Amino acid sequence: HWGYGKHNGPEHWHKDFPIAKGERQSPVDIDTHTAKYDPSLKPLSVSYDQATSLRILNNGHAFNVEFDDSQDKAVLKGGPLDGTYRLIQFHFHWGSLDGQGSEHTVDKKKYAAELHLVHWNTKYGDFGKAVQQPDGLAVLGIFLKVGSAKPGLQKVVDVLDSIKTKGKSADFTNFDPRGLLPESLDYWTYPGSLTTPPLLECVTWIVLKEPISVSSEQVLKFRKLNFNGEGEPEELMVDNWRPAQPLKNRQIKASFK
Ligand SMILES: [Zn+2]
């Protein structure tokens, strides 16, 4: 099965998922000088006041915080988007060292980690149908750098010891994802894909310019997670990022000048 190792990592994914070599794959390098300011882009609307988290799960490739998306309660709209997109989960990608971990890069710079808040277009009724559409998902990407702690992340960090290995899950209620956002909602946007198999080309990417800061101790706890299942040889869950893919026929637009 696919993963992030030498024999099953990103360079292998195309064998099971040929769209890996497609025309709108993610992530990409964001060349900030070539990104075009688009005055027609609207401010992003992030309405997370009623978000309701349900569970946290180690799926063998990341940990997902999964939300109750059965009502209109945590929505992303505006920006480049037409209509309303509902939050279903978030997860991170991170490195074995602070110098790598992000999937998107900015002028080739890698951040220590990257948060993905995954939303589906309500016009398609649920997530499974949305991923089959070219405008099915909107993923809000936020870079993490190591410095001061992010207090709003600590509740996540502190449950990780209970989901150390693949397949483990725990109840995880009342987590407020507003605590993971930076001050500014200035962003870049482009059309792309899921960055994990099945790599479907269904995502409008919205990548915030301002990173959040997390502490070294916080990211060190991410690195204690395992790719393997319980009672298997320990392989730390680190470097679970796909590298930048060819931009091909795409333009990255900036909401800011
Ligand atoms: Zn992701």
Domains and CATH numbers, the chain: 1-257 (3.10.200.10)
Q: Distance between CA 209 and CA 93 in Å, rounded?
A: 17
The binding site comprises: 91, 93, 116, 195-196
- Distance, CA 116 to ligand 1 centroid (Å)? 5
State which residues have CB under 5 angstroms from ligand 1, the bound ion: 116
Resolution (A): 1.4
Contacts of 189 (CB under 8 A, 6+ apart): 41, 79, 80, 204, 205, 206, 207, 252, 253, 255
User: What does the block give as tokens for 154?
Assistant: 């600590």
- Distance, CA 195 to ligand 1 centroid (Å)? 6
- Distance, CA 50 to ligand 1 centroid (Å)? 23
Pairing status of strand 212-214 against strand 253-254? unpaired
The binding site for substrate comprises: 195-196
Experimental method reported for this structure: X-ray
| Contact call for residues 29 and 247 (beta carbons, < 8 A) | yes
- Distance, CA 38 to ligand 1 centroid (Å)? 26
Judging by beta carbons within 10 Å of its beta carbon (0-12, 13-18, 19+), is residue 103 exposed, middle or buried? buried
Known catalytic residue at 61: yes
Instruction: Report the alpha-carbon angle 225-219-184, nearest 5.
Output: 130
